[model samples]
Target: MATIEEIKEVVLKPYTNHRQLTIREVETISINLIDLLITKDVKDARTMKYISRFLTKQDYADLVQERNLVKRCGYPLCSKSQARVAYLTEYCTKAHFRCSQFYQFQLSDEALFARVGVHLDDYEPPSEIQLLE
Candidate 1:
């Protein structure tokens, strides 16, 4: 007979050996997938397939995220037509990205996707999208 602790030790312990927890595959895959797009890595079917595989129904309920449309506003004297958009992860809530510089942002891709707003495509008899022509 195996105890619950013993089973966890044997099965999952190897995955979390450091005092500092290693990033979950979910987080790693999600971040890396986004980074791949920005870093000019593989950007076609194969990488997309890998991303799709990890995006399961369960993930639809766990990834807390946020996004919004930002506007541009700055002093004419100090405004640069091209300025860096800051990601204030330190003080910004998980629901908002704020800028203390009294600045603005464009349509930033903050969240990969929301935890509850995923548009799932059903593959049933009637199917999802109706094709024409």
Candidate 2:
């Protein structure tokens, strides 16, 4: 279901809403769209030109070199099998990366244990404190 239209929306949504994207957003959108195009077997010069307008020359070249280097998603809670986009090289999707950030805030051990355990079977709980006899 990866289409150019979806890629266009992802690339242009921030600009349309007058929202400034972080560097990571730009890198993720650029690499993910480029990888999608490659996967879809797109060879149209005009399509490439349109997408390239948003990319620096170096960024474009780097993405091309890194294409298809699939890796497991980095999000600790992502239980799906989706692999990371080429140069993005982290979470399987942008949403998963954002969700990982949500869990990074200062949290109580009980809260962390409760939340993390929902997704990860190997999450270790804090040990009980020993009392002096």
Candidate 3:
């Protein structure tokens, strides 16, 4: 069906692209495929999940942040990066000494994992020798 075929089509973006797919275009059609999925008559969770391989969690969070319930930094006492990098929640804060480094740690943690790419979490971390030396 047309709907199924359309659903199969994915917009591989630069953030998600590794080497290349559909040569980088000018318009950079940033379509919210997830939102579109809601409107489509997509049945079968397995199939849906398969199609969802193209959907990135980072992209989802970025979209929600851009929704602009309020553009404020999630980190407390330090609004260093009010940009898309900072989450729009109260999870990161510096309420006390114990939390002194929490803000930075949380931000770095987020950035480390919030990659919008085909790169899976299977990549091994650098060896201790490589990091220490």
Candidate 4:
């Protein structure tokens, strides 16, 4: 049961931390917050207006348009732009690559597949020789 102000703070956390919100984060957050507003039965026009100031429909549409133009970060939950370097194909940062690796080693194959799905289709399974008895 989050209040509008609480939702605003969640959306603004990255900005307050001196980092920009990635397109995915903004889009996901905005949609989730809008859903929350409706479910909470908030009827205050002022509250809606306040939220509209930051999470405009046009901005989300533009974000969606921009998302289609670039490859996304490899981390399943990340929506950041991919790294520009040619050699860095999978992840936007070393940290995300490491996180992906950690999850790969930690989770079962089915679990990892469920978590990643089509986002990690580029990750080919190892050949028979690569596995141990």
RMSD of each: 16.8, 19.5, 12.8, 18.1
**Tens-place lDDT digits, model 3, residues 1-133:** 1133454354333334343223233113235454444333344433333333333435434433443334433222222324433232422323422232331222222332233332322322222111000
Best by TM-score: 2
lDDT of 3: 0.33
What overall lDDT, based on C-alpha atoms, would model 1 receive against the true structure?
Answer: 0.27
Error of 2 at 2 (Å): 8.4
Query: Can you tell me which runs of candidate 2 are displaced by over 4 Å?
Result: 1-6, 10-15, 67-133
Which lDDT tens digits does candidate 4 get at residues 95-116? 7566545433432233221222
Span of 10 residues, lowest total lDDT, candidate 1: 64-73
- For each candidate in turn, the TM-score is 0.22, 0.37, 0.28, 0.32
Candidate 3: minimum summed lDDT over ten consecutive residues — where?
124-133
Q: Which ten residues in a row have the lowest lDDT in candidate 4?
A: 124-133
Clashes (backbone N, CA, C under 3 Å), per candidate, total 0, 0, 0, 0
Better of 1 and 2 by lDDT: 2
**lDDT, residue 39, model 2:** 48
Ranking by lDDT: 4, 2, 3, 1
Model 2, residue 84: displacement in angstroms?
26
